[PDB]
Design brief:
part of a larger assembly; 2 chains; A: elongated; B: mainly beta; 47% strand; chromosome (chain B); cell cycle (chain B); structural molecule activity (chain B)
Amino acid sequence: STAAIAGSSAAEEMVALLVQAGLFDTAISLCQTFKLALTSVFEGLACKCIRLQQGGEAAQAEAWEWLAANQLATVITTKESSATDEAWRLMISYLDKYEAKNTLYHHCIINKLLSHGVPLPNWLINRYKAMDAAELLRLYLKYDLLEEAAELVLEYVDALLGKGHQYFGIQATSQLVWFPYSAIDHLRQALGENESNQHNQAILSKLQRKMDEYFQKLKKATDDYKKLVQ
Amino acid sequence: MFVARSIAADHKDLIHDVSFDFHGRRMATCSSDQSVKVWDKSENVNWHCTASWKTHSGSVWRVTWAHPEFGQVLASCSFDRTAAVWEEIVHWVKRTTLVDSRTSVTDVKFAPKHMGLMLATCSADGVVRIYEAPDVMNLSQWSLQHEISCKLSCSCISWNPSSSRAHSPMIAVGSDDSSPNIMGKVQIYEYNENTRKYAKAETLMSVSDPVHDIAFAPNLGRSFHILAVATKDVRIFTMKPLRKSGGVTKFENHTVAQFDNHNSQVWRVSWNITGTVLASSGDDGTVRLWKANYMDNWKCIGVLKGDGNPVG
C-alpha cells in the first residue's frame, strides 16, 4: 500500500513511510539529498531502541533482521549483546558518520529515550558533560530527576576547580567560569515545594554549603589574579 | 606427598603477588623493584624466566590473567591510578592504560568469558568501573560502559563464576574503610537487563568489620551461592535466591561458618578448582585449609610453619 502511495507522492511523504516501516538507512540518505534534517531518522532509531529495552521476543528477532538490512560496521562475539544491543551500536555508528549540529541529534535522542524513562549510560553521560552540560541539566528538570541534577552540579563545580575538567570540556590565567545559575534556581524551587523528604532537604543543605565554600575560594582566587594582572 | 621446592627467585626486591594461568603452566611474578617476570614451565617441572620488564612507578597490587580463548592477555593495577593491558608480539607490549579512576585502583578482575572481555576496576573513591573491549584483535581500544558508585572505599571485587542464564551477572564489592559504626561492608550488585544498569541487590550487614578480601565459590549446579569474606575472622555465607520480574530478586542470607582459629586478621581467601577446599592466610604466618565433610561441617585440615615445614 505504501508502495502505491510512494508511486504518487513527494520527498517528505517518502521519508515518513520509510521511517514507519523501519527502513532507516534509506531515510537517512534521502534526507541528506534534499538537505532535509536528520532529526526524523534519529528519533525513529531511538524509538526502536526504547521498544527493545523493554520488549517481547518476537520484536527482538525482527530487530535482528532489520539490522542486516542496515549496515553493522563490525562483528562482536559477545553473547550478552543480543539483538537489542546490536541495534544500539548501529544507531551510534550512523550518528558518528552522518553528524551535523550536535545540539539537534543528541537532543532528539535523549528526548525520545525519555519516552517513559530510562537510566542513561555512563559513557553517554560523560560525552554530554564534555560538550553541553547545560542541556544535560535541562532534560533532567523536564522529567524531575533532582538528585541526578545535583550530582551533575557537584561534578561541574569540581571540574571548574580543576578536578577532572577534561570530562566537562572546561579548559581551565583564569578566564572561563560560566556557571548556570538559573538552573540552580529552578532546582531549589522544585526542592522547596513538597518539602516532605528529610533526605532531600539534607542533600540540598550539603550542596549549598559546598557551593558557598566554592564561592569564597573563587573570591580569593579573584583577588589574587586581579592583583597579579595589575 | 607434600614437597618443598626452592626456586631461586632472581628478584632484587620483595615479591608481592603471583598468579597462575588458566591451564596451570604460566605464572606472573610482580615485585617491589617495579618489574614483572613471566615464568614458564617446561616438560620437566623446572621453571624458567622468559620475559622481564618494568611496568609502573606506582606500587603494583594485583595481576590477572585472562582466559586463553582471548589470547595471552595480562592486567596490572597500581597505586598511580592506572590499569595496563599487556600482550606479546610474535616481549610484552602495553596496549592501553585505563586512567578514568581518580583514586588508587586497588583490585582488577576479568569478567567470566561468557560475558566477554570486560575488565573491572575498583578504586578507593568508591567507584567500580566496568570497561569492555569491542574487538579482541585491537586491544588498545577500551570503552567504559558501567560505573557503579558504592559510597564506600572499595577494597576487593569478585565476579560470579556461574554461567547459568538464569543467574544474572553479579559482582561483589567490599569495603576496607575502618568505619566505627557503619556496617554492611559487603555489597552485592546485580545487573538488571530492563534498565541496562547495575543495581544493589543485597548488603551483608553482618560484616561490620573491615573487609580485606571476598571470593565467590563455583556454583557447581546448585540453587544457592557461596561467598567467602575475609575480615578479622573467616566467614562463609549462603545466598539463596527467593521465589519468582521488574527488579532485583531479593536474597536470604545465612552464616554457615565462622572461623576465628587464625586468632589474627585474615588477609586472603581462595578456593580450589572445584570449590571444596578454601585456604586462608594470616598474621601468624600460617595457611589453614578448610574442608567440609559429608555432614556439612567445616574443619581445618592443614597448618604450615614459617620455615616452610608443615605443622604436625
